[PDB]
Amino acid sequence: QVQLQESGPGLVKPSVTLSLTCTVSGDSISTYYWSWVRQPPGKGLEWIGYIYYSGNTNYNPSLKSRVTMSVDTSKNQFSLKLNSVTAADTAVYYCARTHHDYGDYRPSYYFDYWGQGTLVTVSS
Amino acid sequence: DGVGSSSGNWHCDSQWLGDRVITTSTRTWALPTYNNHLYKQISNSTSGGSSNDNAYFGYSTPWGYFDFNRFHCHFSPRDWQRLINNNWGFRPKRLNFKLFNIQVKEVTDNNGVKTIANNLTSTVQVFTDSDYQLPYVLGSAHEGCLPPFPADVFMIPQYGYLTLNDGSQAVGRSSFYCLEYFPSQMLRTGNNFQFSYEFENVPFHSSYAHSQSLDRLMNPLIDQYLYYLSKTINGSGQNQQTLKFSVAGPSNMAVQGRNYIPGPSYRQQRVSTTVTQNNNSEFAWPGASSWALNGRNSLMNPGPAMASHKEGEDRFFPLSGSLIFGKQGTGRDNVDADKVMITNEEEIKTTNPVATESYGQVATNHQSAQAQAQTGWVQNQGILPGMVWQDRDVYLQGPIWAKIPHTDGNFHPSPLMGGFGMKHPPPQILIKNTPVFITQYSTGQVSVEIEWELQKENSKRWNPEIQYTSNYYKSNNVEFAVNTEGVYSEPRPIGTRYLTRNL
Amino acid sequence: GVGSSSGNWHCDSQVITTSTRTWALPTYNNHLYKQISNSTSGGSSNDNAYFGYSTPWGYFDFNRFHCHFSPWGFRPKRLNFKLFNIQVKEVTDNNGVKTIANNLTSTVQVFTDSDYQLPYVLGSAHEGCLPPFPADVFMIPQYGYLTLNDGSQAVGRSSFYCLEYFPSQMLRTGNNFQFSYEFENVPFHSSYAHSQSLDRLMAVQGRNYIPGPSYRQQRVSTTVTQNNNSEFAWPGASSWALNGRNSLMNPGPAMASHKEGEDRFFPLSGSLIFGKQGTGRDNVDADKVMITNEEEIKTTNPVATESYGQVATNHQSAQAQAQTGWVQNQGILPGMVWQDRDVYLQGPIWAKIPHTDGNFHPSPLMGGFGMKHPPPQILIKNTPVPADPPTAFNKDKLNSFITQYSTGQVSVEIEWELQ
Amino acid sequence: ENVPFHSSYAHSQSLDRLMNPLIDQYLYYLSKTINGSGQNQQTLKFSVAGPSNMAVQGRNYIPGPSYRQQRVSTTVTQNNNSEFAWPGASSWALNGRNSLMNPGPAMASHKEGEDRFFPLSGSLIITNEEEIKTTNPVATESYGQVATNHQSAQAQAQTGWVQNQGILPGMVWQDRDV
Amino acid sequence: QSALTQPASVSGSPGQSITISCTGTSSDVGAYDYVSWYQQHPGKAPKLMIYDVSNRPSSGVSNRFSGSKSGNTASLTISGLQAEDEADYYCSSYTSSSTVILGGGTKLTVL
Lengths: 124, 503, 419, 178, 111
Fold this sequence. Notes:
The structure is cut from a larger assembly and holds one copy of chain A, three copies of chain B and one copy of chain E. Helix content of chain A is 0%, strand content 48%. Chain A has strands at 3-7, 11-12, 18-25, 33-39, 46-52, 57-59, 67-72, 77-82, 91-98, 111-113, 118-122. In chain B, 3% of the residues lie in helices and 34% in strands. Chain E is mostly beta strands. In chain E, strand 7 and strand 8 (100-102) form a beta hairpin. Chains in contact: A-B, A-C, A-E, B-C, B-D, B-E, C-D. The interface between B and C is large, with 106 and 122 residues. Chain C: Keywords: Capsid protein, T=1 icosahedral capsid protein, Virion. Chain C: One of its GO terms (molecular function) is structural molecule activity. Chain C: Residues 1-419 form the Coat protein VP1/VP2 Parvovirus domain.
């Protein structure tokens, strides 16, 4: 019974970094990867990147220069930071758990749980 | 006893009685004639001998040999589960081997067609080396074993051996062994072969993971009566030297005194499974850990037993520090990481230093008024008094035993790929078709029966263990079973360490 | 019964030593098992991170030599242990004064772990020992244990033990408890100093054996001026990393405290340091503590602050001058011979060899007798007595107990073999 | 008193040559780390351990313990033109005193095909221990190389030479001949 | 890396099997068996349907969905079409550069 919940701003001015947190409830961050996926309205899904409980992170190459993620295991939540948000950044941001079996060397590519999603608007 | 009288039956089962398990496997084998009945010198320079490190000299023999030295020969995946979930340890006891239903087929090739008919008077030669006089090749983890799945027919591998060399050249002290110089037992189609073997006493392999770590063994509620040095200065300024001593207690656990320290380390380079985190250069060979012998460099593989990675870092594995199996149908050369199965030895973190980390630090000088204290890193550490360590894990795909080299001295003879080291392991069993040349080959049945001894757990742990389990999954195929084409596969490497113990 | 004695005081040494003390056992954690971590303690740091449990149980620890002794070789043979004259006292704290009265019916639970199924905390050199002077009344220390942790958190391999789940013996004020224990065979600890040195058995002569292993310690002068003006307690200290946490190397492999002539130096973490009577907990000067020295083993063992020696770092040639380098740590070589660490009046007696695939020279590094089956842990608690429960039924566990504690006597008789 | 037989034989096989030449190992090793000749090339490639590349094969046992020694040539010209008899020697210090490591841990006197060289303090005087070369490491050589760092996209992988090596589980060795 | 390619829309009459394909390079779909499919309804989060090319999650996915892969192309087959079936579908794969890439998605309409 993992339940993801994320919170953040509705509206954000341009050239301002965007911060978003996601709280895992009913289960812990544990040994799983934790990903951020954004969907612009009427557009396809895009994988921003994920973070692991030990802080190891991987990001989308296109967004890699300006994206920072952080996990906090005590508060049982993880967050996302985006730099220089513009018009393109407006999206629904989902925080989805990415399946990973601890201890085997198997890439973790797919999302078996999802957050409700948050709508972020970049506008002046 | 005759041509039309079966000389043996088919046994394929496992019996669990008390503390012992008796597994019996039976397979169908096929023995070609090798080297056209000849003994041919072989060397690197017959292959071109590209490198000094790869230089070898030896001989290839017409004889084949039976290799049951992997666990999937003797254990179904259900038997292996029933074992590793329920037991703290196991070890072989007795071995009973049988060869029977010998069938020799003579082949006649004329134009495109070929005829295969029985050759009734033909013989097969089979003997065991029970004095260990032949070079023992079964502890090198070569292919050519009995198939995991009982319905497969396997080809008997060819025997060969290596002796002293320089470059590709032999030397005066090199040996040559004729395998006809051995009394052996010849079999026609009605004869059969058997012998029994007794495993020499070895320790139980530890099929468990420690529930405690070597540095945490203390009572967390109580101070030690030992003191440690907390401060060498009073504050900021000239001439502040002092000696202060705090007592070691629960708040500062890194400074408490301990009776035992982690086992030895020989550092490995770590490779990430996320390739972009790895360096953009060719470091497979140049960055490897190696040991030089007689001027030749050999990779250290897998090496001493050490945790594959530091906790929270599954992605990294030591370059040569692990055992890497193939998936069913994997290629021989330059396969991708999804084509192989990399074992993980993380269960030994509790007492073994991480393989890709330094052992620790030491002082490099004498501090004094003018000189600051200086520390180096220990990249490799050999045995020190008060070390404890775990041996490497064993796998369903992995080897069972190895032969301890006959030598003046050795330390902790356990083989570095895992399993049970023995000065008198199960003997080699050599087999060939007696020459007549007429094209000829044989086939038949082999049964191998091993008694195993079990060490049960009495554990008082309240919460449930980790067990090995199949997931409840919806898949096109079921794991550890044939596909729609009849090809058996072993999806993942299964280790022995699930149950836990106190340290 | 109530009006009789279950045991007689015995305090004599014959070699057979006997000790007897008076103890007082409180109730720990209000009769509960509580999960502890560095975080419950304020969160600490990475080297200090731990996860475990604290139990209501206490335990007896006689593991120091001054418990059994008043002021060549020896080793324990047999152990005899008795517990008697148990008194369970109750406390009613009412306004100005607390009232203490005998609760005659109450029980005390005791069991030994003789299958070694609990985490074994006795070999960690903790306080809580029987006091060295026979007339002192000591408090019995609380039992707790540590498990696997990734941090302040727990992994799925972390285990939880309940001590109520062992069979134990219940003792009222008339009942007593005894068990006997045989020590396993251990070598005689060598209570002597060599008269000869390994090298003088002359620098260039050939020799059959070599000095033992080393892990070099930093050197500290007891004259403060001769030490460097910087903070090097931890930053300059020898350590070993395990699963990504650095633990100080303490005391380490047995090594000579110092070279002949300089006795003002001590290895940083290489020695056992003890406190003087009444010494504070934190930041006490060099006079408040006692710094041991292992000078006597300097015959077979290298100096802890000295390098082990030199090696060749290259191939000399007509173009190349020979180069050497200092060996800061040396593992075992065939042909080494060494001496183990000395035991002290104040020091530990035995330790538990961890259950592992392999060990080398299992003798514990702080001194004493390394054992697979050491003297078992002896666990004790006051049986909880509930105060009056409600008169309508409720499913919750009972959170209200009578304030209560117990006292009694402890005798421990160890036979010793001499050389 | 009860003692083992002195071994008076020479092994006909070497520690790194124990395997069967004809048959491929079922184990895999990491043969290639980059696609090559380009920017941002990173890949993991594995190959079956083989007869062709015996150096990378997994092994149950490893060579015996070594302490490095200086190498001396009988020919005067090959040796350095200086007095390095004591300064270049390998020694162990006990109680503030340096004692020469004579003879020292058993090690091969020289590599195969190198009759001229002898360890500075290594052998009894000039005997040779070429017989134990198959199991024991040469006394004038590094034991091997270890990794000295964590590689990364920023940092190349490094190694260092092991001049002395203490006992490791899995080591085997021969002792010095009488 | 570059995105997986899918047809913009597909439609099928109720009760008839339909297939959606996604094409990728030899580095993503072609090299690995790491392909997953997600089904998304408007105003809701995507739901995992296929993982590991043909595997389905233990609960919440009917047996009417099946994944498959050939060469550089992966495919999602829905049979016995229902009204609930119409949704947006996404291909997703694990690439050679250790990153996750998805398809553009295809909208499926049931008549």
